[PDB]
Amino acid sequence: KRQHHHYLQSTTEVDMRYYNDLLNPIPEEFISVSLILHCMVEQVVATEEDLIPPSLVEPAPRADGLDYRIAAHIVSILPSLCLSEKEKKNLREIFLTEGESESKALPKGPLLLNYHDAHAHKKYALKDQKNFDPVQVEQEMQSKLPLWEFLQFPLPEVERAFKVFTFESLKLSEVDEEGRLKPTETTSDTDVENFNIPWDNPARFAKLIRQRYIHRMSMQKAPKKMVVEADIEDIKKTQQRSLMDWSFTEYFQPKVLLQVLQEAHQQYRCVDSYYHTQDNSLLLVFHNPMNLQRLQCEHWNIALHSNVGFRNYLELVAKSIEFRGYNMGDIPIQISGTNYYLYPSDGGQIEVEKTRFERGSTFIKVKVKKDKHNFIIHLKDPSKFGSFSATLENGICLSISYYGSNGMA
Amino acid sequence: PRICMWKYLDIHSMHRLEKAATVEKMREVLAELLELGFPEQSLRDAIILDLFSHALIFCRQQGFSPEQTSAACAMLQDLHKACVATPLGNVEECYRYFTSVLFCHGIRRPPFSIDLFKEEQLLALADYVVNTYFRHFKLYKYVFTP
Amino acid sequence: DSVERIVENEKINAEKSSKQKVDLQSLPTRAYLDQTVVPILLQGLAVLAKERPPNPIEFLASYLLKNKAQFEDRN
């Protein structure tokens, strides 16, 4: 109890208006997760700074003189009147704003958009948005993701063949016989061999053979002129895969490549990076390491520290501290989860996650990935709850349960 | 031409108007604040209430900061009073009067002005203003002038 | 009679937002988020910004797990 005590010493209506004002003039088909969270943050800053939400607000006075509105009546009243082909936009530049009188020479939508550039499409359907650019806002939030560091890595066929051969000589992440990801062994002597690719930096590869050979003398000499000569099998052994069936290449822009990288991040679990010293380029591989049974396993146990009572301090928390706690009113938080990743030969993915609360409920989630579609079952306390949910490629969401619209057995 | 911020509507009345998310409740709140009578007994108070209510509605439609709200409300009230202060045709004098009043809010030089505002919003007004009321100037003239 | 009963049911359903869990699993992204985590997340972010602990992720998760009862049962 003394150790427990020392361990401790070491309406509901939420203001909703500011967030609503930034998404209501935006259709839901373009309201993304990054855009919602940005308006979360603006809501908090406005609450702390007492910034009244933007909408219910009149503004900036006038150099010919009067209030705000009654031409949002007129600029909407205007278009039904009596005659010809020149004064509606002189009375839609004096009567639709000078700020929107910036009529660019029709570049908005007649424009070629990349197959992978979704942001350029959102900028056209929302070309008429005023005082708020969700496309730029969405790009700014995605720039804080970990995938952005790959586009800004630190700096210190024949060329095309060398790069392809480098990928073939690249050793990717592997998993053990149980499916657990093999840790990147930080052993001093064996780490040299992974970074010496004969197709990228043969000078290191030249010394690797020299180091390997000098060792071989040392074992042989234990109780011219030696010419260390490299051979073809020394280069062939480095090859790990074959990309002879990869002749098509697609070029992307920095803003377009980021979207492509995000898409591959949701389909692959492991991302391997290699720095090409010849042209200062960074090589990336989005793959899924698997065992002979096509399974990847992931175990994780986290016991969030709390002010657990004397009974809860000794059962789950005393062993883990043999700091910093947070107030829960004597309720321990120990979350343990097991992740299984199945990959049939058809290209589909089966992602199973089993999360259990030591003092709560056990939740099991089975996700099936196939043809960019998502099929999911949610189970609670294996059961009490059962429901099937789906999310197609186009974004249409489905939900059904045998136990009714509540899903409660 | 002076700074019309928190002149007729303060922060408390504006917050009351903000909690009124619906058109009808907000019209009721504006009628309570402006000391206007019931719209069913006088047409002038009804016209004023409708003007201010729709004004707040479209200002909701775009979105800005509260000091701007009070500045725009007080400037509307002041220029309505100026337009109805005399029975003679006085379009251009109110025109130039509030043209001068802008610069007392659109450009940063205290104490005669303060930079609460942006150029785009300004030009938006130049737009909407010269679009409606000086077109409908005779309508309010026939009503609010002897 | 069937049409009138359907009208009355639509009246009740517009007056009562369907907060059933399976119905929640289909709602659009913004609608699904607004009715599930948005107010508690905003409160947690406000508390985090007012206090600013050195462990922000852990503090936010602790706040979510502590005040989940004030937002899951009100629905």
Next chain:
Amino acid sequence: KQKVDLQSLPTRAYLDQTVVPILLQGLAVLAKERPPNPIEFLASYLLKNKAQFEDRN
């Protein structure tokens, strides 16, 4: 990225440098998945992937 100077940053900067990168992925997974327990799932995601966002500072 020291924990002392993060406290002195503005609200937006502190949130962007502390919880925004992980909350983005958490809410994305929550919306794409939609489990029956949104608050608990988001908290578990924040705790589970806190390493991938705390070690980068």
Next chain:
Amino acid sequence: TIITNCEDSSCCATFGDGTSIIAKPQGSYQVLPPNTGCLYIDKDCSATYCHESSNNLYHPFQKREQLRASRYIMKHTSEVICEVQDPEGNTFQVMADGSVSTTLHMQIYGEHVPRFFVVYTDGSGVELLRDSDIEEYLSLAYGESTTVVLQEPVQEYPGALSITVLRPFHEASQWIMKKELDTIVPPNLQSRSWKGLSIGSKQLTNIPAPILEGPKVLQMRQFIQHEVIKNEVKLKLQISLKDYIN
């Protein structure tokens, strides 16, 4: 758009993208994605997904379709909540308790092919694409009447060939529908200037889309097809590399 029956109460709902969902009074459903796949929900809310494309179009990659054909049976009211058999014969089963089971240098990927990227210092990048994945995409491009596919030899690269694909798109929301009849007015009163409800694989006879003469948005995807590296070239580069190291 709702197309329902007045005798057996069978209904079908179609969305803007072309997704069609058919519901039966017994409690079964069938979701038909516009591109590929087929999802079926039975009375017991048991989900069954089929990769087999409903349309019987002449796909020159029928061998590849058989390698991707698999049935995902998926139930939330049974002990086995996920079961699927791959074309290789491996049986994957997920039990209701979260446990899984499977019944059965040169790296072979099959369809789990990794994506290779080459990021430069300016933020741009080049992705290595498998030949089979591009030829299938081009085959669908040549089959569409509104899709224009362009080729011309690279003016600088010898032997390389860059392939470009053009496709008109929607200027506005894709979910905005268009009625079956643009006008319902008698063909002469205008002022002049089933087969059965076969919910199965009825080919959606895509009327060759009216040739959009200058559509306002053209979706673009550009490839670069280089000359395939031969073993003779690969062996020659190994000899030059060997003489380099020596």
